[PDB]
């Protein structure tokens, strides 16, 4: 609804997600369970509380 999935950059610790044909970039954050730990890992941005998780599980 207000969540967008994408993939994270290990080097940049960011999540890139697509919305309406437009890429957006958001900081994964520094928490050990939120930062990007593996390049291209599934990540999700929650628009509502402006939350990011770059360790989205399967």
Note the resolution in Å, 1 decimal. Answer: 1.8
What's the length of the chain?
Answer: 58
What is the Cα–Cα distance from 58 to 51, expressed in whole angstroms? 19
Cα–Cα distances (Å) from 35 to 21, 31, 40, in that order, read: 25, 6, 12
What is the Cα–Cα distance from 20 to 53, expressed in whole angstroms? 21
What is the Cα–Cα distance from 21 to 48, expressed in whole angstroms? 20
- Method by which this entry was solved: X-ray
Architecture of domain 3-53: Beta Barrel (2.40)
What is the Cα–Cα distance from 48 to 37, expressed in whole angstroms? 24
Residue 1: how many other CB atoms lie within 10 Å: 6
Judge whether 43 and 54 are in contact, CB under 8 Å.
Answer: yes
Residue 36: how many other CB atoms lie within 10 Å: 24
Strand partners, 8: 15
The pairs formed by 23-30 with CB atoms below 8 angstroms and a separation of 24 or more are 26/52, 27/52, 28/52, 28/53, 28/54, 29/54
């Amino acid at each position: 609804l207000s969540k967008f999935g994408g993939e994270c950059s290990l080097k940049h610790n960011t999540c890139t997600y697509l919305k309406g044909g437009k890429n957006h970039v958001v900081n994964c954050g520094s928490a050990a369970n939120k930062k990007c730990k593996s390049d291209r890992h599934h990540c999700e941005y929650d628009e509502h509380h402006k939350r990011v998780d770059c360790q989205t599980p399967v």
